Amino acid sequence: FGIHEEMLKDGIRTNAYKNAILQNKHLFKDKVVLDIGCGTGILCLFAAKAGAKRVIGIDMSDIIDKARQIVSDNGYSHVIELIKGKVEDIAQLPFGIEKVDIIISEWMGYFLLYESMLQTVLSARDRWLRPGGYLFPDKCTMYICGIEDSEYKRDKIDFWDNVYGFNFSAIKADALREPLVDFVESQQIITTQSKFLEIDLNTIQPEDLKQITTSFEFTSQYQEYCQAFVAWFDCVFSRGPHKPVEFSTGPFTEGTHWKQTVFYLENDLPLKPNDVIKGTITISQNKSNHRDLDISMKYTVNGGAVISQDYIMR
Amino acid sequence: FGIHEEMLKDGIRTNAYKNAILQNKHLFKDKVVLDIGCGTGILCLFAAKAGAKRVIGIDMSDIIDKARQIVSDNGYSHVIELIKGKVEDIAQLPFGIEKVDIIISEWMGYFLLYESMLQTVLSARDRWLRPGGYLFPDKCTMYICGIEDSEYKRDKIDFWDNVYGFNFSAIKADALREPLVDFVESQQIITTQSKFLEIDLNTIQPEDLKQITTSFEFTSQYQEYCQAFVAWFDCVFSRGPHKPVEFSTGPFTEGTHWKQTVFYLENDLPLKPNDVIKGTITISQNKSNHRDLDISMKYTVNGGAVISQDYIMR
């Protein structure tokens, strides 16, 4: 419902897709395009306008009936075909199509990986993408840095110390375990930014997603307290477009509906300039609710004792 | 998760419950209290602090395990007993209790009735409330008025006329059919306010909720265009407290997490001062998704032709 208006009115995202598709008419001309999660159909309309021979959109949502009407009203009912259901439940693609040239998708979730459609996109790639075909977009990179956020930490974590006189501190751990999806101001960042994960749809395999172990490293720029780490991702249309097309969900550029992801620290870090925060982040589907993401960090400051903290986004 | 922090940090709501309970220690002393949907337990703690002999909290949420810890940390483990599950699945109340003196609940949904716990509260009242017992709160009243909102109507409805050159007008009806939960500024109101529904927990019966037909009437105060109706509800602890306790979710007082409910009109009304808008609102559970609320309005301006518009909150 409102999720579709939010996706469309996300200008940064829809403009990046618009540019990647419409500026590459040469690449789309007379091609067969599969779009995973077409929603109201704007990306399918772009691909058709770019000259695709056939655009197949899959959405599991009941929006499909209205999306077909939109396709008709814009004169593309002979080019764009919409199908309901899960990729995994599709007997065949329509019109006897066996392979496709280009897969468009918007699979990225919050924190890139939370409730994402990555596995669906990889199944569709494995089933239908012709050798050498293109994935729009194909590369996402995750970044992390440290911030000052004493005010929000006091309002959101320490609030539970005293609630109308009552001790609610039993809840504090749970509040700390939940990453926050929200915007951070760039002036709050007190460290360099660390690339810590890349996901390349051209080469990644589903078994690689079972448990992601990765490392990160960033450096303090200030004499300051660090209350939280913040993470975001960048997304690149790399293989396919004539020039690479990119957009960011970070705090130095226009906001997106993904916002940023804030991981509050149990114990604030007292940082000096040039202090080094380095560690590992392990990401995996939660073992009791498969929709939940377990995110475990272990790290040090200048090689001190290891600090560990576990989070679950749910 | 965050829903519990949002409920608690709703100051207007939690203060009204705090006042209704703690200022009526005489009424709670040595009584048996049932609280429906206890969440992290603050209302149960109030009832215990007010002197209840026994407080039974029901919540279907996994929050129960942490809520028990909160009850223990504040010294009330012998008074407050928490039970998981639906009222409808409870064999008996603990400690051999058969009747209770007071039922506390926070059953109100958006637009009062959307995904509310009203039916659960009525079942608990019918099963367990002693004759003459009290419901905290027991009375909610709904109000409606007309507003000017051309800017938000243009940004949210007319946006679909042209989306990157494409005609998305097939979606406009669906956008109009969805009431918006959001805050309205009081300066946007251009009519008097109409009480249009009262729900009295002391006397209402579940069969009355199958379909609510009610009437409304309000008067234009300006020469202005009306783009939407806005509705809210007020909630009163009426029977029981020494003085009635009240709070509002309307736009003339502090915001609450319920916000207000905005019903955009298909065709703007050109109103003159003293024009009368009068009609009926029919509210019923949707026939294909029982969690969805159908809200149908028919009305006139000074007895002109009947205007009808159907909405579904989903």
From TrEMBL, chains A, B:
S-adenosyl-L-homocysteine binds at residues 4, 13, 40, 59, 87-88. Disulfide bonds join 38-44. This is type I protein arginine methyltransferase. It comes from Naegleria fowleri (Brain eating amoeba). The chain holds residues 353 to 666 of 666 of the full protein.
